[PDB]
Every structure is written in C-alpha cells, then in structure tokens.
Amino acid sequence: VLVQDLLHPTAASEARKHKLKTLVQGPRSYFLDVKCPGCLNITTVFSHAQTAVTCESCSTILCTPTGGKAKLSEGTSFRRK
Template identity: 75%
Template structure:
C-alpha cells in the first residue's frame, strides 16, 4: 500500500499549516525581538506576544500594543527577530 504523501519528509508548506505541536519537530511560534524607537533610536527587547503596552525608556513613546495574540507594533517602529 503506497501513500500519496511522504510522512517522513513533509513539504515546508504543509508544516507551516500544522499546529505548533503537531509538526515533525514541535516548537514555539513566539519569539523575542529588538524594537527600535523611531524618535530616539533606542533598542528595546520585546516579546512577540506581549500582554502589556511596551513604552520606550528614553522618550516614553508607545512601541507596541497588545492584541488577542501577537503584539501590534506602532507605525514607524522597526524590529529584528532575535
């Protein structure tokens, strides 16, 4: 009996659609990121699923706001995944 799909070597597209615990190698989808403030250019480390408002230490500008899942970055903020 031959299967239509290879269970040991799934395609990257098929792995991306699966739940984080149902993939071949389970792992989290959350991450930490460095967010650069557009006003004073200081870098702050922020969790991708932050549940509180993150404010810049230098100029007190809001960097990201919580949503139901991932935190939403404000306009003009650039980020880099750690």
C-alpha cells in the same frame, strides 16, 4: 496515503500544521528589536507581548497587546530575532 515518509514531512505542509502537531512541537513566535525614529535605544520585544512595552525612558509606547501578535505602535522599526 497508505505509504509515506512520516519521519520526513514536507516543509510547506509542516508549516501548515498547528503549532503542537508538527514532528516535534515548536513555537511560531519570534522577537523584534524595536526603536522609534527619534531615540537610539535598542528595546527588544516579543511578538505576542501582553504588556504595553516602552523604551527605557521617554514615556513612549512600543506596542499594544491583543488576542495574538502584538501591535507595534505606529512609526517604529524592527528586525526579527
């Protein structure tokens, strides 16, 4: 208060702000590489996917959509990038 480093906010406070209200606005979302423990297909998704994403075939289901972060369907793997 009164005198502070506006050009250099902390990190733990910059991560507390709203998506648009940081020093330069940036997305809080990511991407997951997701497969099921049966198949060998590296199907990459979005954190907040709005579509019931599947593997290229096998009529499987990777995620169900919601009001925010998508819901990875049951037993499935994921690395974040």
